[PDB]
Amino acid sequence: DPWQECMDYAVTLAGQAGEVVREALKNEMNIMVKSSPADLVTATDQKVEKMLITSIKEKYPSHSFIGEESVAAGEKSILTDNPTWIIDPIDGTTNFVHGFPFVAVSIGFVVNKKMEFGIVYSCLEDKMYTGRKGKGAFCNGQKLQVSHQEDITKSLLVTELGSSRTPETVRIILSNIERLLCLPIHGIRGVGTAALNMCLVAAGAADAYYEMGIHCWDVAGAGIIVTEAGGVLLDVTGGPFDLMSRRVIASSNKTLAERIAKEIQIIPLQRDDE
Amino acid sequence: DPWQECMDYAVTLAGQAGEVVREALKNEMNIMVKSSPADLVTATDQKVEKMLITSIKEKYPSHSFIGEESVAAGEKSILTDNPTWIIDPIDGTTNFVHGFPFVAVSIGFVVNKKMEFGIVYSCLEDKMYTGRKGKGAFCNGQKLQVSHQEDITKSLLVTELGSSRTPETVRIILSNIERLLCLPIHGIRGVGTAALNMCLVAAGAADAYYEMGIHCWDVAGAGIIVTEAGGVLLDVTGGPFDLMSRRVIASSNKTLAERIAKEIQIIPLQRDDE
Numbered sequence: 001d002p003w004q005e006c007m008d009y010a011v012t013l014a015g016q017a018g019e020v021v022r023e024a025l026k027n028e029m030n031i032m033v034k035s036s037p038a039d040l041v042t043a044t045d046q047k048v049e050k051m052l053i054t055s056i057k058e059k060y061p062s063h064s065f066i067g068e069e070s071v072a073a074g075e076k077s078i079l080t081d082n083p084t085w086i087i088d089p090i091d092g093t094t095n096f097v098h099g100f101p102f103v104a105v106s107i108g109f110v111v112n113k114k115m116e117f118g119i120v121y122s123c124l125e126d127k128m129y130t131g132r133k134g135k136g137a138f139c140n141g142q143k144l145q146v147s148h149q150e151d152i153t154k155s156l157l158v159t160e161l162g163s164s165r166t167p168e169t170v171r172i173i174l175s176n177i178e179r180l181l182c183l184p185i186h187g188i189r190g191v192g193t194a195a196l197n198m199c200l201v202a203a204g205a206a207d208a209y210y211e212m213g214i215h216c217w218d219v220a221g222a223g224i225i226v227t228e229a230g231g232v233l234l235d236v237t238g239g240p241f242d243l244m245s246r247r248v249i250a251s252s253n254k255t256l257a258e259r260i261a262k263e264i265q266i267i268p269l270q271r272d273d274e
Numbered sequence: 275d276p277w278q279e280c281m282d283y284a285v286t287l288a289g290q291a292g293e294v295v296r297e298a299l300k301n302e303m304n305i306m307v308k309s310s311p312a313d314l315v316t317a318t319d320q321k322v323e324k325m326l327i328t329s330i331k332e333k334y335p336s337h338s339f340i341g342e343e344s345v346a347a348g349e350k351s352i353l354t355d356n357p358t359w360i361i362d363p364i365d366g367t368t369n370f371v372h373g374f375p376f377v378a379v380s381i382g383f384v385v386n387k388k389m390e391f392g393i394v395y396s397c398l399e400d401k402m403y404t405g406r407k408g409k410g411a412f413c414n415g416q417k418l419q420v421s422h423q424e425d426i427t428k429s430l431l432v433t434e435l436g437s438s439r440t441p442e443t444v445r446i447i448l449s450n451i452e453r454l455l456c457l458p459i460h461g462i463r464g465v466g467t468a469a470l471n472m473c474l475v476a477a478g479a480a481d482a483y484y485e486m487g488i489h490c491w492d493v494a495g496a497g498i499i500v501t502e503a504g505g506v507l508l509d510v511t512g513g514p515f516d517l518m519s520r521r522v523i524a525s526s527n528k529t530l531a532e533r534i535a536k537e538i539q540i541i542p543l544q545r546d547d548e
């Protein structure tokens with residue numbers, strides 16, 4: 001089972017990356033700015049990504065890579081049918097900078113443009129989330145299952161305010177939150193990382209997650225965990241989920257997903273493939 | 275040391291209450307609503323409260339009690355100088371109903387209308403947060419310390435959307451978030467409970483917490499944990515913290531607290547002592 005060997009190797013690697021992250025948390029940081037004042041990167045993000053990609057590439061030199069900080073350093077963000085590793089070295093950089101205890105290493109493996117396996121390591125909780133097509137979803141060995149609430153007025157939803165600080169954009173995000181909150185729903189949550197918000201849905205701790213402004217690396221590892229736990233992915237348009245589209249609804253079921261799509265106003269964004 | 279004997283006993287009872295909450299997560303729930311369609315209560319909330327008060331009262335029958343569900347049943351919430359136990363049997367009922375893993379038992383002990391000790395047990399995490407005036411703040415025996423960021427534009431703030439579903443109320447809460455978000459700040463977080471949001475600030479995982487709409491039982495146990503970890507409490511008016519006012523800023527430092535107070539709009543609220 002070649003993909004299982006890939007996965008086993010990558011789980012070990014994610015563990016090693018999380019040790020690096022924990023040690024760095026206790027040292028002084030170099031906090032740099034990317035696309036907005038709220039879009040942060042540290043030297044640890046960059047170091048961990050280099051560690052991960054150079055290791056995996058050395059072992060699997062014919063595979064392809066899409067990494068967040070690699071793309072920031074000029075690599076192209078193209079998804080082909082070739083086995084592709086989609087890496088977020090630190091999902092929740094802002095959390096890392098503050099010691100907010102939801103910081104993930106995320107690794108997605110994609111073949112024929114379909115998610116095959118995903119690894120999301122919650123570094124500060126020591127929780128290893130895994131999933132693989134046809135194999136189940138787990139947290140530290142415990143099988144994961146989504147909840148089953150088809151009534152949005154009894155749902156607990158998850159989302160984030162995003163790194164944008166452009167007033168028009170922030171206004172639509174908050175207007176989407178206002179619309180949903182007043183349907184009414186039970187509440188909105190978030191822990192400040194897309195991967196771990198999705199893992200909370202996978203585990204049955206909330207009913208659905210949505211966000212616009214994410215990238216393929218934020219969601220590729222957690223997407224298969226959600227679906228192997230029994231959930232569904234959709235685009236915010238109602239159509240099929242598209243990994244390169246910057247948009248996601250990750251839901252325990254289709255009824256909830258389709259309803260959320262109906263209430264959300266779409267923001268404009270640069271696709272990861274343009 | 276009389277109050278230490280009170281505290282040691284109450285930590286044992288908090289542990290017992292947390293085991294009751296964890297066993298209830300398993301079984302069917304009776305979900306009732308209180309002050310709004312999103313203000314939930316279960317039989318477990320009511321059970322735990324009665325367990326706590328009957329037990330503490332037998333040991334300390336001259337002391338006073340203020341409990342969330344007792345007040346909901348018609349009891350008064352009068353704070354006198356008499357040693358007073360202020361109890362939130364389950365802080366985060368919505369989280370409890372959904373399995374969102376931040377659910378707390380909160381006990382505050384107040385003497386001469388001053389916080390003396392506080393106990394906040396994170397049930398699903400097995401994290402016992404404690405604090406006593408002149409003794410320090412701890413999580414499972416490890417001393418807590420707030421972080422030190424005096425620049426709000428580099429801050430991570432914590433808050434919640436509230437249980438109100440009244441449009442005019444939700445509009446101000448979201449406007450306050452918009453104002454803060456665009457200062458700009460690094461982000462807003464929350465885990466869906468006042469007491470655990472405050473314990474995250476105590477532990478240095480976020481820079482400050484604010485909310486309007488809370489009650490004395492939401493904050494009495496965590497308040498002393500925040501101040502013994504080196505933080506400060508303030509009213510949103512900039513004045514001293516008032517436990518019965520339905521308003522709180524719990525901050526690592528005074529500079530951030532005062533800036534938050536300057537930026538947000540107050541919502542009118544029925545006091546706990548009116």
Ligand SMILES: [Mg+2]
Pocket residue numbers: 039040041068093
């Ligand atoms: Mg980033």
Ligand SMILES: [Mg+2]
Pocket residue numbers: 045068088089090091092093
């Ligand atoms: Mg990242």
Ligand SMILES: [Mg+2]
Pocket residue numbers: 088090091092194217218
């Ligand atoms: Mg990310």
Ligand SMILES: [Mg+2]
Pocket residue numbers: 313314315342367
């Ligand atoms: Mg309540």
Ligand SMILES: [Mg+2]
Pocket residue numbers: 319342362363364365366367
């Ligand atoms: Mg409560």
Ligand SMILES: [Mg+2]
Pocket residue numbers: 362364365366468491492
């Ligand atoms: Mg409460």
